[PDB]
Amino acid sequence: AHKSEVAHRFKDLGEENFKALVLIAFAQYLQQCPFEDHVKLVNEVTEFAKTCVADESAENCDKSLHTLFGDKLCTVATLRETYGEMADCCAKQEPERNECFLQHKDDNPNLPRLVRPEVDVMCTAFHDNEETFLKKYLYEIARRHPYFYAPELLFFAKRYKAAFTECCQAADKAACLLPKLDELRDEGKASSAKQRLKCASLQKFGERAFKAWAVARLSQRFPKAEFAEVSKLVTDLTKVHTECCHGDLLECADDRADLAKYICENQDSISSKLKECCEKPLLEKSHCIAEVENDEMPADLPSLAADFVESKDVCKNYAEAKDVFLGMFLYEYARRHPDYSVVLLLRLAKTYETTLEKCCAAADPHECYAKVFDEFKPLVEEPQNLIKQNCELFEQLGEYKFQNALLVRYTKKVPQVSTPTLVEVSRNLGKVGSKCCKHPEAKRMPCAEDYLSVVLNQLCVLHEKTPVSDRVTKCCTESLVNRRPCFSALEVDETYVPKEFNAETFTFHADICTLSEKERQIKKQTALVELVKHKPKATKEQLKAVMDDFAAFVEKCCKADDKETCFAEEGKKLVAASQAA
Numbered sequence: 001a002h003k004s005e006v007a008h009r010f011k012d013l014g015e016e017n018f019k020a021l022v023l024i025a026f027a028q029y030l031q032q033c034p035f036e037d038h039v040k041l042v043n044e045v046t047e048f049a050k051t052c053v054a055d056e057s058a059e060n061c062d063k064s065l066h067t068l069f070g071d072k073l074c075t076v077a078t079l080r081e082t083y084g085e086m087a088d089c090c091a092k093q094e095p096e097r098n099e100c101f102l103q104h105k106d107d108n109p110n111l112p113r114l115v116r117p118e119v120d121v122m123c124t125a126f127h128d129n130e131e132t133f134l135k136k137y138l139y140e141i142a143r144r145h146p147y148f149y150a151p152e153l154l155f156f157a158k159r160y161k162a163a164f165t166e167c168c169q170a171a172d173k174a175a176c177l178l179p180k181l182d183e184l185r186d187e188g189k190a191s192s193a194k195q196r197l198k199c200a201s202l203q204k205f206g207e208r209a210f211k212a213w214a215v216a217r218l219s220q221r222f223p224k225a226e227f228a229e230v231s232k233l234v235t236d237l238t239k240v241h242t243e244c245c246h247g248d249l250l251e252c253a254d255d256r257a258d259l260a261k262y263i264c265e266n267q268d269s270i271s272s273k274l275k276e277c278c279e280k281p282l283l284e285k286s287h288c289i290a291e292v293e294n295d296e297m298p299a300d301l302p303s304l305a306a307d308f309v310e311s312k313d314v315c316k317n318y319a320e321a322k323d324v325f326l327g328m329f330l331y332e333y334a335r336r337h338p339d340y341s342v343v344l345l346l347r348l349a350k351t352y353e354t355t356l357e358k359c360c361a362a363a364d365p366h367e368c369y370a371k372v373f374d375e376f377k378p379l380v381e382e383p384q385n386l387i388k389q390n391c392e393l394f395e396q397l398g399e400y401k402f403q404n405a406l407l408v409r410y411t412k413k414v415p416q417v418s419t420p421t422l423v424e425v426s427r428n429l430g431k432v433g434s435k436c437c438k439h440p441e442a443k444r445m446p447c448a449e450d451y452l453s454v455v456l457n458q459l460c461v462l463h464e465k466t467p468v469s470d471r472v473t474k475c476c477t478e479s480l481v482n483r484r485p486c487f488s489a490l491e492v493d494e495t496y497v498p499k500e501f502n503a504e505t506f507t508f509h510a511d512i513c514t515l516s517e518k519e520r521q522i523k524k525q526t527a528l529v530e531l532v533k534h535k536p537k538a539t540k541e542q543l544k545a546v547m548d549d550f551a552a553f554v555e556k557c558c559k560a561d562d563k564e565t566c567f568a569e570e571g572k573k574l575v576a577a578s579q580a581a
């Protein structure tokens, strides 16, 4: 092992990525902390790290990264008045302190909306002080996204920098800049959500849950690779994410760089698709390897029957190494089905596992588990149908109206759920329609189903913060694999007593005329969830009336050029109609 860990990571990562990764670590633990305080702390930690590189036996150079980083964070976090119960983490020592910070990560920090300033003013600040502009980005995203995959946030940290470098020198700065920023915002929300699911799996369901997931996905991605190679990649990938999820970001970034390096040096044994990625710089290389197209599978792969049902050693091999054998099953089933969602492949492996458990205790196990693959049929057909059915509804409704349909459905199922959580989750589910229905069938399932997992997990973690519905808690705690059907099965809450009516939540203001079309949609969708919470028995027919009427007076008052009287009177008609009943 290494004398001085901060020295080892400092020299392995280089100064620039060290400081950026420590700034993220700090920002993801103490989300409410001001930017300038975090930068000062990172500066001190970094100065110290440099004394350790020069001399590894200097005073505190042999402490853990968390002891070093923890103490520095607590110089500003022991402040209970301006923060809160983050002060109690500083009453603990490692490793209990880090565990405390991990458990206090807030998925919905009460933090200001991030308003985007004039392209002209953004561009001025960028040339003025480049480094600080980019630290500000790192900081703002990390405190709002406490599980953002740190190494990818650095890649995320290299691209807006490229965007600003290029677009601030363009003739039309805004035409260059905005679509690049819009695309980075969306893909960043997708990245965050994707990583929250990896962490939720690791932290709540264990390393074994995560590995089976990795075996399934990497076997689809690298179908030419040998099981022993996939297994090695799974081990290295699992160690990387366990570290980031456990707040060991320096180690996480280092072990990821090592893995991308390993992958590119063993390319002929992994995938035929890695060529271009492996010529890119470190950050875009790692990103490219992570998003790479599936390799084409080998041509005439055998049936899998002779290794997993017909063989006389099926029950013996399972007994002697349950986990690598099932891993082998998942490797072989998943390589052959890039058209199956990861979550479907994990269900198939569980059904095979539960079948061996029952049948390897029978008279002749072979006669018991003989028709095992036959039982996969309804498991396979079921996602296919939901997706066919749901994509058809999408085509006749369009994204926006599709979202509204889910808002109404999901509000009736679980009306106790926070309104901003219902809006976000339904809108994002509605984004499955756009992103996945555009595909031919055999590509649809992984796209639609694996993305639902990401979105339902957001629902689970947002609801976990302040739980309000036992049934959501149940679906969220029961399994990972069984989450989508546990949610689909939920029926309309009859027990739910309607909400009283509040004028304010259905009264709008002129400031809505200044918002983008999208924000204005989000506003109407918010009002729509509140409508259903007020009258949950209302018919789809009734709903569309108040919706179209909402649209007309938004239309009418934004073109009324008066004294907010438009948004007042039309907000008084709703207050009068309610006081009357």
Ligand SMILES: C[C@](O)(CS(=O)(=O)c1ccc(F)cc1)C(=O)Nc1ccc(C#N)c(C(F)(F)F)c1
Pocket: 114, 115, 116, 117, 121, 122, 125, 132, 133, 134, 136, 137, 138, 140, 160, 181
């Ligand atoms: C004017 C400025 O505040 C310059 S800056 O203070 O150095 C800064 C840079 C990046 C930030 F995310 C926040 C603040 C700025 O660029 N702010 C800003 C605010 C919100 C968003 C968003 N979304 C952005 C963007 F660069 F990310 F678009 C930038």
